[PDB]
């Protein structure tokens, strides 16, 4: 982090800042069309017509989907859940 997306809305009728339940967003970067999701910390209101979004990227969501995590090696694990097989092995400890 931590950044900002100046975002404008002038076609309003009963709004101002009040486009409200946003927290999460997406960004498809045009045009490498790689994608990235971010949380939105806050939402400042610059005026009657344009509000500002503070962002921090959901690195987890963004980068970890699929089988990625399971191929990392030589990692010191601290808590996880176990496959039947790996559970039996650790069963005494638990």
């Amino acid at each position: 982090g931590v950044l900002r997306v100046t975002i404008d809305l002038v076609s309003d009728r009963s709004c101002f800042e009040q486009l409200m339940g946003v927290n999460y967003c997406q960004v498809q970067y045009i045009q490498s069309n790689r994608v990235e999701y971010l949380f939105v910390t806050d939402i400042q209101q610059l005026n009657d017509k344009v509000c500002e979004l503070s962002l921090v990227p959901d690195v987890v969501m963004t980068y970890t989907q699929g089988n990625v995590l399971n191929t990392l090696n030589n990692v010191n694990v601290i808590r996880q859940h176990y496959t039947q097989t790996e559970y039996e092995q650790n069963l005494e400890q638990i």
Binding site: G1, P57, V59, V60, T62, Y63, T64, V68, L69, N70, T71, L72, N73, N74, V75, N76, V77, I78, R79, Q80, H81, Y82, T83, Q84, E86, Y87, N90, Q93, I94
Partner: protein, 87 residues
């Protein structure tokens, strides 16, 4: 035995946070192992192929503190955790 509730409160705890572990140097047990969700928490040193150097960090240190990888949306907001299971 402990009481029906306390029994469940314990069931839940393990369902939500998995198991104390002290395997400096292993590979994570399958992340997709459980049915409802799947805690994972580990410490350096790993690099994910092709990522902002500082998103890694942000990523590293996010797991060192741990991340509950849910497996269905329903569950993310339902009293289901109680029934997590190893397939």
């Amino acid at each position: 035995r402990i009481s029906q509730d306390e029994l469940n409160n314990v069931k839940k705890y393990y369902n939500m946070f998995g198991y104390e572990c002290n395997d400096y140097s292993t590979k994570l047990s399958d992340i997709t192992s459980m049915s409802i969700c799947n805690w994972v928490q580990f410490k350096g040193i790993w690099t994910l192929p092709n990522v902002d150097t500082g998103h890694m960090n942000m990523l590293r240190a996010l797991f060192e503190a741990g991340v509950r990888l849910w497996h269905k949306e329903s569950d993310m907001i339902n009293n289901t955790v109680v029934n997590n299971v190893i397939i």
